[PDB]
Amino acid sequence: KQDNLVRAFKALLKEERFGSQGEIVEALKQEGFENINQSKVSRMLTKFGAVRTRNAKMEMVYCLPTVSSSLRELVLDVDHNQALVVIHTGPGAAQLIARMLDSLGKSEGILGVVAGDDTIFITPTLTITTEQLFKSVCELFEYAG
Template sequence: MTELKKGGPVRRQIVQEEGSGREDSLLSVCKRLLQQQSFSNQGELRVRLEELGYTGISQSTVSRLLLQLGVVKAKNACGKKVYCITVETAPVNVKSSIASQIEFITHNQSMVVVKTYPGSAQLVARLVDSDPHREILGTVGGNDTVIIIPRDIEAIENCEHVVKQRLGVA
């Protein structure tokens, strides 16, 4: 945490450093707030975070938090659009458990194929899609097969390598 002084009382501002634990704490608090309360805009969420002691939170920080949490806007029972976290939109992280769901990864002249155990293909496709890469044009996930379309079929081996790295199989 860094303290800033602007001609008056000391104001605390969060400095989000990778691996500091503070960002995870802010992310956890934001997630809990979204699960417990309704917020119709980023300003409302920012104000609530400040009330909890997280001062110096900018709109862009709130926007990044919402993106990391996979938040969507949906109508509540009163018809008002509010931010929601759903299982479907929760962010996916690469873990060794993902690799355990994959039978094999291969390619032909035009696409990369990831064969998974039944029911895992859509999760794997979402994981590949969650962080766009210049080698990957798009994915299609079925029940137990993911088809990955490379941007350039001349670089199909590079595309397969990227997919393997993303899925922890490389």
């Protein structure tokens, strides 16, 4: 079952047409993996070295290979809660991406950004909503969050 899930997952990446973690979860559920969830999908994206790429249809999508990869291609997910916008990236890319985001600053609604190895926390200024900040970050990275 696990070998089949890995094969199915990699095939979705090879199609170069899925743009978000939720899309991958839904595709796998439709294939029969009833217990699939975002936690499992996030672990697989990290484990198998998935990155994003702009396909020939101009869509930012996951793919399976990274010296020529761009920072934007290193973003794997953008999500949020009431207080923070959280980005997940490929291993060790969070710091580099956070450097760029914290340069955008308060005028763009970013009060501050802190990154871990593959996770970034973006906190908003009092003048922008977490949802608007979320929408702006999704636009910057072309992620269908």
